[PDB]
Amino acid sequence: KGLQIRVQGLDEAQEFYELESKADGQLLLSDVFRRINLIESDYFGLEFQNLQMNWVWLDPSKLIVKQVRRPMNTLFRLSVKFFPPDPGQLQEEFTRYLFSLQIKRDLLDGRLSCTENTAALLASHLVQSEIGDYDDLADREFLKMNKLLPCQEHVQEKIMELHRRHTGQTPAESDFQVLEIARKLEMFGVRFHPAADREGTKINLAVAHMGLQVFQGHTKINTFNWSKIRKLSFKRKRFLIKLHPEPHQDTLEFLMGSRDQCKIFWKNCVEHHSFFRLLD
């Protein structure tokens, strides 16, 4: 048979895709990339909402019908999968635009936590990009009907104040400022995978362009560069980081919630390493 799949773009606009029932994840990804003419598409992937309404990555090598129960009723969305160290250096204006929309998303849903002043500054550039130069009446109208920050009301004056500085800046220049600000934040591109150490201390694991990170709360306790990592594995609920000597306990153990969570994080790490270090 044939399927009709709904995919939400980074600009929040939903389009519909007609695909055969035999389609892999890769076919849908390719059709989405073609529809929006995304040339630098390797940084991006698709996630969907499972029945507990959590977001899961679409596996491009598996059949879609084997990953999702009601593909016709399921929401998919375009997302950045791999954050490069400096998205401002991406070649295409459209790609940088998509990255600024990813930041916009992360800022609103709280993935990108930062100080209030930094949030306000990011939001002020985001306002410049959508509606142009500062206007008292138009800025208040926009902020009434658009939410950029999780707790925006008491920050709105600061957002507008800062927006007065950006007179004359084009949407592309605005996107660039958003990327330059965001790439310098500790939480940029960060996605937490909760776990506990040997002592039982709650921590968060994450993977990024340089290697693995360890967080306690929102403060980063450690970074293991790819060069320092000998091997990554998982044994049931345990995730294992084997380090190169120098030097005797060369293994860090982290207990995660389920085996499937270990596995998802392991795959994420192997994919990151491959993407940022290996030539296919």
Author numbering: 49 to 294, 298 to 331
The authors write:
FARP1 (FERM, RhoGEF and pleckstrin domain-containing protein 1) and its close homolog FARP2 were identified as guanine nucleotide exchange factors (GEFs) for RhoGTPases that play regulatory roles in neuronal development. FARP1 and FARP2 share a conserved domain architecture, containing a N-terminal 4.1, ezrin, radixin and moesin (FERM) domain, which is followed by a long linker (~200 residues) that connects to a Dbl-homology (DH) domain and two pleckstrin homology (PH) domains. We determined crystal structures of the FERM domains of zebrafish FARP1 (zfFARP1), mouse FARP2 (mFARP2) and zebrafish FARP2 (zfFARP2). As expected from their high degree of sequence identity (>60%), the structures of these FERM domains are very similar to one another, with root mean square deviations within 1.0 Å.
The corresponding site in the FERM domains of FARP1 and FARP2 contains a negatively charged residue (Asp97, Glu100 and Asp107 in zfFARP1, mFARP2 and zfFARP2, respectively), suggesting that it cannot serve as a phosphatidylinositol binding site in these FERM domains. In particular, the FERM domains of FARP1 and FARP2 contain a Lys-Arg-Lys-Arg (KRKR) motif in the loop connecting strands β5 to β6 in the F3 subdomain, which is highly conserved in FARP1/2 from different species. Overall, the surface of these FERM domains show highly polarized surface electrostatic potential, with one side positively charged while the opposite side negatively charged. Interestingly, both the FERM domains of mFARP2 and zfFARP2 form similar head-to-tail packing patterns in the crystal lattices, as a result of interactions between the positively charged and the negatively charged faces of the proteins. These packing patterns lead to a linear array of the FERM molecules, which may cause the oligomerization and precipitation of the proteins. The first arginine residue in the KRKR motif (Arg277) in the FERM domain of mFARP2 makes a salt bridge with Asp216 from the neighboring protomer in the linear array. An equivalent salt bridge (Arg284-Asp223) is also present in the structure of the FERM domain of zfFARP2. The linear packing of the FERM domains of mFARP2 and zfFARP2 in our crystal structures suggest a potential mechanism for the oligomerization of these FERM domains. The KRKR motif in the FERM domains responsible for phospholipid binding is buried in the oligomerization interface. We speculate that the oligomerization, if occurs in the cell, could be a mechanism for regulating membrane targeting of FARP1 and FARP2.
